[model samples]
Target: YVMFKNAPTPQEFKEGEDAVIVCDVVSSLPPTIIWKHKGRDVILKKDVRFIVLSNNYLQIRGIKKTDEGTYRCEGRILARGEINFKDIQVIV
Candidate 1:
């Protein structure tokens, strides 16, 4: 089964505050995981403020109004072609 060990919660934060969304995947086979912000892919390496850890945790250093949106964590199993997803709303 695929699941988020540490899922992000819906919360409001002030600007300049740090936001970390953890998506620890628990699955039989090592699942491929990706993050989406407002239905768009969150390219961790491209953004200076957005950092994705080795364990699939997404961290935004400084929260901004533009950062407010629905964040999604999607995990897929290769063998079974199974997909699991979860969403969390973030307000700034």
Candidate 2:
């Protein structure tokens, strides 16, 4: 079983400020973590403002109006092929 150890909560932030959304999961087997914004895949390299840390934490260099949306973390267990997900909304 895989469960979120730490997840982001609905919050508001100011523009130009840094925002960090943590998504940590514990599982029986190593799970794959995927991040999404507004139901779309979050490509870490595609945007300089977005950075994903070693612990599956997402960091936004500077919060922008366009960054306001729902962020999701999907965890998939390799051994059991089970999937779980969580979402948080960010308002700017």
Candidate 3:
């Protein structure tokens, strides 16, 4: 069984605040997780306003109006080419 935890619960980030989103595996087998922001890949290492602390957690710093977007969490159970996704709508 695979799972993700977000949405149905607002992930709010006020001005100058921080927001952290986690994409973790729920099944016994391990998988490769991917994070997307506004339908694009989130490579925090190349960006300054984001942080990728550990492979599963992504944090956005100093939220602003430009930060408004949808965060897509991909939890793929890599066997049999299985895949799943969970979304987070972040608003400042």
Candidate 4:
């Protein structure tokens, strides 16, 4: 079965706090994943930081007030499109 390992659960954090999000994919192949925030796409900025680990983990450091919202991880396989998603809520 396809699954994400140690997926973060919805939680609350204070403004200007440090947070980390980890996502793992286990299947026949590693899936292409993207992280989305709010209703808009999140591009890594100096003030707001994010990183995609080689181990298929996603990390977000130093959160802000604007970072409060729902976060979703979307995965897509090369042969297939939009395999699945793991959604989590972030309250700040």
Candidate 5:
């Protein structure tokens, strides 16, 4: 019966600047976390801006002005079927 209660701070990215937003999830049951931006799934690539840490930390790189919006992280526990989420707004 674990839950996520904290989220990363809101990020502000310049129109043409690059930034990284990290979201971390800590749990003993290995929760699966999904990161989304404005209802869109965030795809990870080899690019320097997209980084998925081994400890379930998500990073977004090369942020643009158009990237400003509400970002959410959803965590789900496998066995308990419990889901929790946290959101932050990115301003550019």
Candidate 6:
């Protein structure tokens, strides 16, 4: 009943440049989405150049050696108790 749309495979991005990873999900209702780096680190505004948009998109400005990891995007529809996740391997 719920699924992730346009899920990307492992991707590569240029260092010192900006890249946007989009996570699209479709469900009965709007889902609460969250992004994480390696399932441990929280992707938040705490990072000076990282931007998390409301529409489940992540933007990394000035990619670097430290930005390589398996990024996980989680989509949750609490009302329906449905959850989905997509992982992307990022090569910087």
RMSD of each: 2.5, 2.3, 3.0, 3.2, 3.1, 2.4
Candidate 3 lDDT, 9-88, residue by residue in tens: 24667777776765555543666556776637876444677776554666777767677677787766666476777776
> Total backbone clashes of model 6?
0
Ranking by lDDT: 2, 1, 6, 3, 5, 4
* TM-score of predicted structure 5: 0.67
Candidate 5 structure quality by residue, lDDT tens digits, 43-87: 443445666566555555656676678877777688778777778
The C-alpha stretches of model 6 lying farther than 4 A from their native spots are 28-30, 39-46
Off by over 4 Å in 2: 28-30
Per-residue lDDT for 37-73 in model 4, tens only? 6644453342336666665554567667787677887
Kindly give the stretch of ten consecutive residues in candidate 1 with the minimal lDDT sum. 37-46
Worst 10 residues of 4 by lDDT: 39-48
User: Residue 55 deviation, candidate 4, in Å?
Assistant: 3.6
| lDDT string, candidate 2, 3-24, tens digits | 6887766867788888877678
**TM-score of each model, paired residue for residue:** 0.74, 0.77, 0.68, 0.67, 0.67, 0.77
Error of 6 at 24 (Å): 1.6
Model 4 regions more than 4 Å off: 27-30, 43-48
> Model 1 over residues 1-92: C-alpha lDDT tens digits?
77678765575667888877767877666657778866377774457778777777777778788888778877878887887878877887
Which residue pairs collide, candidate 4? none
- The weakest ten consecutive residues by lDDT in model 3 span 3-12
